[PDB]
Amino acid sequence: SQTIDKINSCYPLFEQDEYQELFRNKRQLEEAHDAQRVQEVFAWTTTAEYEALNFRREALTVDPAKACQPLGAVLCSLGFANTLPYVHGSQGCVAYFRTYFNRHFKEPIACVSDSMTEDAAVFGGNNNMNLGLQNASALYKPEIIAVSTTCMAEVIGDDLQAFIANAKKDGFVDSSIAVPHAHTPSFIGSHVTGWDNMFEGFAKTFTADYQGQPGKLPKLNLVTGFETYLGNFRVLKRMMEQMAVPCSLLSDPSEVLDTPADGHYRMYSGGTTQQEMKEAPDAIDTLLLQPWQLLKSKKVVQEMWNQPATEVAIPLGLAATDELLMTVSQLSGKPIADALTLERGRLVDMMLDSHTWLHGKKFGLYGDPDFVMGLTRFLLELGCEPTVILSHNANKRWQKAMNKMLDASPYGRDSEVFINCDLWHFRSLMFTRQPDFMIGNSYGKFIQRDTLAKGKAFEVPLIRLGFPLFDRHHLHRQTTWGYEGAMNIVTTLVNAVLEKLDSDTSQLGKTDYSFDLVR
Amino acid sequence: SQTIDKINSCYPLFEQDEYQELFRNKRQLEEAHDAQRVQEVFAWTTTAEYEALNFRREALTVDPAKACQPLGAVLCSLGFANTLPYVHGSQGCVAYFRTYFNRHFKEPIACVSDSMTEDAAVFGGNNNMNLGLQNASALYKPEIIAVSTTCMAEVIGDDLQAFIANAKKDGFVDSSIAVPHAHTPSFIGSHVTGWDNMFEGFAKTFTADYQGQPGKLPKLNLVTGFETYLGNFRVLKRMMEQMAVPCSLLSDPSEVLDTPADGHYRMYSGGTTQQEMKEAPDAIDTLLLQPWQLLKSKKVVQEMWNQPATEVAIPLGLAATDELLMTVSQLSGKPIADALTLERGRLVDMMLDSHTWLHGKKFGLYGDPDFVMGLTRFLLELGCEPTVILSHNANKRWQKAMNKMLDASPYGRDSEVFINCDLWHFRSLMFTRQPDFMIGNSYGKFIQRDTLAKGKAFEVPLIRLGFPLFDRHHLHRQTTWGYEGAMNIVTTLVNAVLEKLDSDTSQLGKTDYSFDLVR
Amino acid sequence: TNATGERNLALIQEVLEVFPETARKERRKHMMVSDPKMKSVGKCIISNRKSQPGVMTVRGCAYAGSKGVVFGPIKDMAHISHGPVGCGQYSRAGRRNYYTGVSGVDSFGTLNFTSDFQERDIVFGGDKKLSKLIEEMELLFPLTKGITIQSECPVGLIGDDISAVANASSKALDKPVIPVRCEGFRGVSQSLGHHIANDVVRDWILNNREGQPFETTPYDVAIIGDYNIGGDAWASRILLEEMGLRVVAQWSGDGTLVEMENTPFVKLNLVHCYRSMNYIARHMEEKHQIPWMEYNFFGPTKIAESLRKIADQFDDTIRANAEAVIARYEGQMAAIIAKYRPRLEGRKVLLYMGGLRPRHVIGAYEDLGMEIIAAGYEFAHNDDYDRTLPDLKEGTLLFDDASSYELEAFVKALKPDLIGSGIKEKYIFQKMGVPFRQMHSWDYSGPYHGYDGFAIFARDMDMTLNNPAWNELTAPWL
Amino acid sequence: TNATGERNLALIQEVLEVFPETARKERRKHMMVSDPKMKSVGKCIISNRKSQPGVMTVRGCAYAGSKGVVFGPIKDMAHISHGPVGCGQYSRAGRRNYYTGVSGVDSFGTLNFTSDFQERDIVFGGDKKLSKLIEEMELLFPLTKGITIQSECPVGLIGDDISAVANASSKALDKPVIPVRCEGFRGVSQSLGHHIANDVVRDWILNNREGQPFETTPYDVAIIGDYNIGGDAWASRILLEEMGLRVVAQWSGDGTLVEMENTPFVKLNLVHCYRSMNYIARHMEEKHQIPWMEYNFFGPTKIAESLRKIADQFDDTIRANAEAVIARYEGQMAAIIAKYRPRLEGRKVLLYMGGLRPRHVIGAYEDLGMEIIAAGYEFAHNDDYDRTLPDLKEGTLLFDDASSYELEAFVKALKPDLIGSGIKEKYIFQKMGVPFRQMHSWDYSGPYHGYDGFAIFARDMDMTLNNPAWNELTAPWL
Ligand code: CFM
Ligand code: CFM
Ligand code: CLF
Ligand SMILES: [Cl-]
Ligand SMILES: [Cl-]
Ligand SMILES: [Mg+2]
Ligand SMILES: [Mg+2]
Ligand SMILES: [Mg+2]
């Protein structure tokens, strides 16, 4: 039942007596395991014994912490001006890529499929490509149609290059439209692989035959790789403007992912222009900011464009931001701006002011390989201990570099790094290694719940940094790179500590001797 | 006891068995009231009967939500370049003003006393003023010594103006130093009155003999009043730069409250310059952004500077920010910048994206009068219900304006406004009116703790917006005005709703049918 | 037709002028204007065809229909997304098919089990990996009652034989292990996934307790086709149990393999979602002689009609019980109409959802005084269009498998006061200044079924249509 | 003196050069360099003098010493900040004088009770308001054991008579109502507030149970002058009870009116903070013939010394117990020293706090091999400086009531590795690149007394002195 003055949604409607009774009655018809047996099995799943069995898996994956290649190609493609992402293959994939980004960004996501079905399974997807490019061009009027693929297309071996040439020659798509492509098999690598593959296709389309000369333009290009915080595209531009060093981001979806609600729907907004991509080989250099995933993009830069591809670490944290700005200064010959040095000192002031709550705190963390390395680095710089470090889509070379960084640090002595392991592995580790907190995305909420069910003393609270973030709003606007993003990370970490300490000391007459006003 | 591998601080050290035994033994020497009696009294303090007696108070104040005048004079004084705040009177006051701001800003706070003691109580404090100005000048070399008073100085009737005139006459303070003053009696008004009184002292000292001409300089002055968010000073300057309208803030402590940790202590940094204050009468107009407390500042602008003192609401929320920009545009003749209309539309997108979690939510809130009026207005604009609205230091004229606003809103039908009431009064209202959440400062943690002790169903979580914020770090960096500040507010409110809903639905096997991944 | 029908026929013409001539002619057969004198759509519309390539169809795939819709909600079984990692990750906990249990222990709906195909699996086949995965599953998740294998695109394309693996593993574990060939390249939309899944249930689940004793009552029923979005099926089940019926099974919201195996013993199948589960209802009538009927638990008019018709299949005791249940909730219903109908009446709605709700929720909107000016489906068949005609006012725009272009153009021209559609549509229409409610996920609210759900539905349409922020899209200086 | 002493005497002369002549000469008598053969300071330093106007002294007032330090901690009494609103608000829950209880019900330390003087109270006097306040307090806070009235500056200046009010209200309530004339202009610092408060305790609390039955033991003691910062007094109490003593009272950390009233029945007073509570200890010796002794529970060297001396006031049983307690914690101590001494040995520390800790913590620092290079107090008296001399290395700078200017100049010249001081000093010295630990509030950590506190102290000094952020104050390009 419901009362008119206070209508209850699902929770807490179903807590009402009539629904508790309903559930008792339904449970009699399910042949439910006995409650003691369920409790026994749950307790068993929290043990070291269970963990050893869990870590023997070779074939089953449970709660993965990665997505497939085309998702990354779509995000890359969204970063160019007047570009329509197009995924050649089966349509289910495109409903899911759009929905996945919709729920993180809270924004519309334009992306089409050419709807290959069983017919296309037999004959090849050439008809779908021809009609799909013609219909997409007619309805959405893109300047660029950025083609990637679904696994069906890859298995059947559709020749993308040849289909796209055949479409233009036959008049299905106007020749003035740019149609970069990339093969993005979801059974290789992950969504970060797709992003790098898509970027290589844009670079081929816009620069293959170009006679470039590095330093002809006194600019630097920046390439972010797969990144879903709007503030990171924006802070890079802001710091380069303070440095007075001209810059293009190559793939910048930060305007099309944040159009205003002003009565108009804008499918296209901002983004890297064709002029910026076509003149990219003339820059001094191109800085690949997530180096572990930008592998083919480094080959573009060095082999096609004959630029240095000056190695840079992901610009997360104080030291890594310092290194980015020293690299920008060395390449450009311009001094670091006094406003940036002031911002740096304010970050250090925050670090000193908050260090007693962070020093020695233990964290678990997971995510993409570049992000996990960057955040692990900054945690060591804060005097925190990243004890459990997992990246499902990382490789052995990355894991070797991680252990090298950890071994060198006073704060990496109890740190364990896991690759090709998923969140059901991470869940066991939260039970056995019990860090103070875990840093993850919204899938970590289930692990927090699981650890709390063992008991309040075992709960590992989640700190949301990463992707996807589906259960809080507007975190996608944040910044995690530069001094600005390090300020966010410091504030988020310290206040997570303080919120948990307040909760633990909030029991009137029991633990509130330490419920201090001032912290 | 302690083990070398995991040293425990106070909490949770005192949870250990040996300390629980210590406490049970110590309790036997206290003639404690029995637990049953203490429980009975706690329960009675949550009731409507206790509330009625609580609201009969005419003499006892418990848990005030205001501070005293000189605190606000110190903060106003910190906002002028090379200015040393000086409080004529008893030194205990200055130790407390410094400490109070140290704990909110996590920064050093320069302020001196002239240490009036029993001798000055009988002779008056003219000797303390002479020596105090002389010693402060020598030690700290300020360009401006900005003098306010403590209650001892007020009660004994120290003639501030005469004392300073004597110090000048007798060579205790050099002619190169400006010494603006204000009487700031703590038994009148609150800290907001001290800020306004201090501002009037600066206006007299720097402008009284000046023959100004409004619009000789094509600029606007802005006066914030008592404000402890660094982002609010910054956002105003950033929006004015985007408008291309020259501006000065008159009192801007945001640089001296955020100096870098670079190996140097800087007692002075930034601030309104003497040139800005002295040329203030030549601006087009001065906009008083917290109008209820800026009473003598309005008389300055109209009676001394013969400027319009165009009325503006505190620029908190979407409509009040639109109204500030339309006012700036109308007075300057300059159009609203396209970047500001873009930012406005992104705030509206956020409001639409998050509205289903905020609509109909009930809030209690307290703070200073201008802040509470602005936050109540924005909550009504979000379709929230500000059911319990308290401002300890607000007056009857403010209350009449609040009730007029609430009567005109569909979302103000159940709202009750309380003035001259404190947080013990607020505590009863959280028990009897039980809003969903309460917006307040760190003193509200004890009310959250008290409501949770009645039961989990009765808990009213605190959302921290106001001053002082002592138990989280770096919230003083944030912004609450402008579109930028409204984005912080919206994000803060919806994610408080979602954090609470996750917590409520996080019991494995019980309420986690609604622990949804996507929200 | 009337002046609305004429304006809508002109609008169809104007909207479709953008399409290349071939697609244009094809698309014109997917839209029409309703006529209250028409019992069947006949030739007026076509549906369940392939989507036009490249037009940004809203549709999903057969794996969404099978794993995402029919099998994923079954709480006591582990469902494997078999293929590369994407499909299972994007559909992990996206659909709010509520259930109670202890996650990862006796209930598995929020875990994503996958065989995470790598290139090696494409090249040598994934059947050995699947068999080893199932062994590891059983070791780590011993309380599963059964396991399903949801094929993704590559599995049939590389020639794997998951039915051979399922047969061998079922014997090895001594539990049902059920193979589903719901590769997304099959069919044209989510719809073929439903059909595929119903055929699999028919062969691999429904006969599992054939010939066994089962204690019946005269009032045993099953809820067929309610996936318990936000607890919709619980808000429905309560009314049927209050009317003296025993709900033996719920397919598949909060559902169990056990309940499904016990469904052939019921007296009457109650079909809510006709599109997704009419197949198995027809099968149970033909094989087990169990009658079935379609019903609608959206809003008071439909609920009362449904309770009375369901009770009419039994006897006078259940007939009297239906009147008693309706009388019991009449004060709640009157209060909801009195508070919210004045805030909503007269306002115009556009609906676009998958295969049931675009017609099914119309009564509840009409109970709140609202009018449907256009209704469409992603993947419905012509028998769904036929069933939509009785609840449309003359001249209403009725359409099928719309592109994003077409939805945007219909919205711009028709200017509905409120739109009900999905997550991919939400943030576009909000930026256009049109109040929007997600009518798949309930915009994280619900339930909307039942008497308790009608309160929430009314609350939610008012909250969003009348929110104060819709008056602020234009800056006040513009 | 030695080389270190000469450098400090030259630094003294250089620092004071900025002061106007009058102040310069006065300030010179507040600083000296220590001599290890000196047992008394004599004429070498002066202290407990007014502060210099305008110099930014660190000191507070007598209300801070009475309300904030001595009475504020007593949990079972309500303490009224009587006067305008500031004093009570800035001192609300600033000092971490821990206690257990039910806030607002049987324990009141975190509530801020005040009479919120307004202009009419200054013109017409506050006694009528105070009497009404106390009636309202009794109605809303019935479980107080007693009430104190802490006067702020205006009260005595306007001629109010709170003693008459306290006597009348005590009769009406049948509970102790204690008037304190601790107006902040009285005296020169927090110190006179201590002395005022002790005299008030002497006359309004201590005699309340004279001649009343009380069941004693031979080993009854009171902890005098431990305000339980971060649970310091609990970490001290546990050791005394482990040694076989009964701690009848704790003054006043986690303290009660009842414990204080039972204090004249103990066998021995154990004074930790000499400065704040030596007055009442001497009084109890005179009036009740209770012996008292000073002790120090900072670090293992001082704890062992104190346990042995305390036990030497009793009998052979407590003497043996002292050895057994020291032996029981030896392993713990040795493991702390072996882990943290190597990380801290040889580092130099400057200390600046109120009236006790600047000398009291030196042993703990020495137990981790750290060296104190300068020590000063805000408000100590010459008997405190006398008590500092035994624990300084020859030539150490010893100073009194330093301005911000002097402390900054000392730190720039001495270049301590670590500073221990208060909240107004913390953020200045951190920006100067000097590791800083709050040694009043323990930087929100503690306890630091006792064996359990030594482990936390060591962890904390290491945490801050060796933190990796201290190598980042200078940008890498500079
Ligand atoms: S879009 Fe239902 S035929 Fe199917 S997931 Fe939604 S309108 Fe589906 S009612 Fe159902 S619970 Fe659905 S809302 Fe039939 S199940 S393939 Mo998207
Ligand atoms: S500054 Fe103690 S004589 Fe008094 S509050 Fe701190 S060095 Fe006080 S030990 Fe004590 S608990 Fe203290 S730390 Fe004597 S009580 S007026 Mo500021
Ligand atoms: S139509 Fe449907 S969702 Fe698409 S793949 Fe096919 S079953 Fe699946 Fe899958 S891993 Fe990624 S999302 Fe695809 S490219 Fe393949
Ligand atoms: Cl990698
Ligand atoms: Cl006011
Ligand atoms: Mg949005
Ligand atoms: Mg700081
Ligand atoms: Mg169950």
Which has the closest alpha carbon to A233: A215, A203, A206, A256?
A256
Task: DSSP for B51-88, please give it.
Answer: HHHHTT-SS-EES-S---HHHHHHHHHHTBTTEEEEEE
Domains C1-61+343-477 and C205-318 share a fold: yes
Give me the numbers of helices (H) and strands (E) for chain D, helices first please.
20, 14
Q: CB under 8 Å to D91, separation ≥6 — which residues?
A: B96, D63, D64, D67, D68, D72, D81
D291 backbone dihedrals φ, ψ, rounded to 5°: -65, 155
Q: In Å, how far are A216, A241, B57, C41 from A219, measured between CA atoms?
A: 9, 11, 70, 63
Instruction: Flag if A263 and C474 touch (Cβ within 8 Å).
Output: yes
The atom number, within ligand 3, closest to the CA of A71 reads 11
| Bond prior to A468 in cis (omega within 30° of 0) | yes
B222 in reach of chain A (CB within 8 A) = no
Resolution of the experimentally solved model in angstroms: 1.6
Residue B518 burial (CB count, 10 A): 18
* Residues D420 and D51: beta-carbon distance below 8 Å: no
CA of C379 to the centre of ligand 1 (A): 10
Radius of gyration of chain C (CA): 23
CA gap D380, A265 in Å, rounded: 72
CA gap C394, B462 in Å, rounded: 53
Residue B464 burial (CB count, 10 A): 21
Helix axes D423-431, A338-358, angle to 10 degrees: 130
Give the one of C431, C444, C468 whose C-beta lies nearest to B519's C-beta. C444
Radius of gyration of chain B (CA): 25
B237 in reach of chain A (CB within 8 A) = no
Choose one of C57, C353, C378, C379 to mutate for the ligand 1 pocket test, by most ligand atoms within 8 angstroms of C-beta: C353
Choose one of C273, C443, C444 to mutate for the ligand 1 pocket test, by most ligand atoms within 8 angstroms of C-beta: C273
Contacts of A15 in chain B (CB under 8 A): 511
C-beta of C57 in contact with ligand 1 (< 6 A): no
CA dihedral B251→B254→B258→B264, nearest 10 degrees, is -40
Q: What angle do CA D11, D14, D20 make, to 5 degrees?
A: 135
Residue tagged 């003054």 (tokens): D251
B439 backbone dihedrals φ, ψ, rounded to 5°: -105, 125
CA gap B287, B310 in Å, rounded: 6
Structural domain spans, chain D: 1-61+343-477, 62-204, 205-318
* Domains identified in chain B and CATH numbers: 68-211 (3.40.50.1980), 212-316 (3.40.50.1980), 317-360+481-519 (1.20.89.10), 361-466 (3.40.50.1980)
Instruction: Flag if B473 and A499 touch (Cβ within 8 Å).
Output: no
- Architecture of the domain spanning C62-204: 3-Layer(aba) Sandwich (3.40)
D471 in reach of chain B (CB within 8 A) = no
Ligand nearest to the CA of D71: 2
Q: In what order do the strands lie in the sheet with D348-353?
A: D31-33, D397-400, D371-377, D348-353, D418-421, D436-438
Task: DSSP for C141-207, please give it.
Answer: -TT-SEEEEEE-HHHHHTT--HHHHHHHHHHHHTS-EEEE---TTSSSSHHHHHHHHHHHHHHHTTT
Which has the closest alpha carbon to B90: D124, D405, D187?
D187
Going through C361-400 in order, the beta strands assigned E by DSSP cover 371-377, 397-400
CA gap B255, C346 in Å, rounded: 56
| Bond prior to D447 in cis (omega within 30° of 0) | yes
Contacts of A11 in chain B (CB under 8 A): 501, 504-505, 511, 513-514
Q: Is the CATH number of domain C205-318 3.30.540.10?
A: no
**Active-site position among A74, A112, A151, A312:** A151
Please count the residues of chain D: 478
Which has the closest alpha carbon to B366: B467, B434, B289?
B467
> Quick check: helix, strand or coil at residue C351?
strand
- Architecture of the domain spanning D1-61+343-477: 3-Layer(aba) Sandwich (3.40)
Which has the closest alpha carbon to D72: D97, D48, D53?
D97
C426 in reach of chain A (CB within 8 A) = yes
The residues in B 322-381 lying below 8 A from D, measured between CB atoms, are none
Which has the closest alpha carbon to C309: C330, C327, C323?
C323
Known catalytic membership, residue C61: yes
B321 backbone dihedrals φ, ψ, rounded to 5°: -75, -45
* Residues C246 and C217: beta-carbon distance below 8 Å: yes
CA gap B251, B301 in Å, rounded: 15
The atom number, within ligand 3, closest to the CA of C83 reads 10
CA gap A146, A182 in Å, rounded: 8
Give the one of B345, B353, B453 whose C-beta lies nearest to A473's C-beta. B353
* Residues B90 and D157: beta-carbon distance below 8 Å: no
Quick one: tokens of A446?
Answer: 């289930």
Contacts of A313 in chain D (CB under 8 A): none
* Residues A128 and A115: beta-carbon distance below 8 Å: yes
Which has the closest alpha carbon to B386: B435, B443, B444, B457?
B435
Residue A144 burial (CB count, 10 A): 25
C307 backbone dihedrals φ, ψ, rounded to 5°: -60, -45
DSSP secondary structure code for residue C19 in this structure? S
Task: DSSP for C404-466, please give it.
Answer: HHHHHHHHHHH--SEEEE-HHHHHHHHHTT--EEESSSGGG----SHHHHHHHHHHHHHHHHT
Which has the closest alpha carbon to D249: C397, B390, B26?
B26
For the stretch B188-209, what's the b/e string if a residue is b when 16 or more beta carbons lie within 10 angstroms of its beta carbon? bbbbbbbbbbbbbbbbebbbee
Q: Based on the number of CB atoms within 10 Å of its own CB, is B28 exposed (0-12), middle (13-18) or buried (19 or more)?
A: exposed
Instruction: Flag if B92 and D61 touch (Cβ within 8 Å).
Output: yes
Nearest C-alpha of chain A: how many angstroms from D95? 9
Instruction: Flag if B449 and D103 touch (Cβ within 8 Å).
Output: yes
C103 backbone dihedrals φ, ψ, rounded to 5°: -50, 130
Which has the closest alpha carbon to B41: D108, D254, A510?
D108
Contacts of B41 in chain D (CB under 8 A): 105-106, 142-143
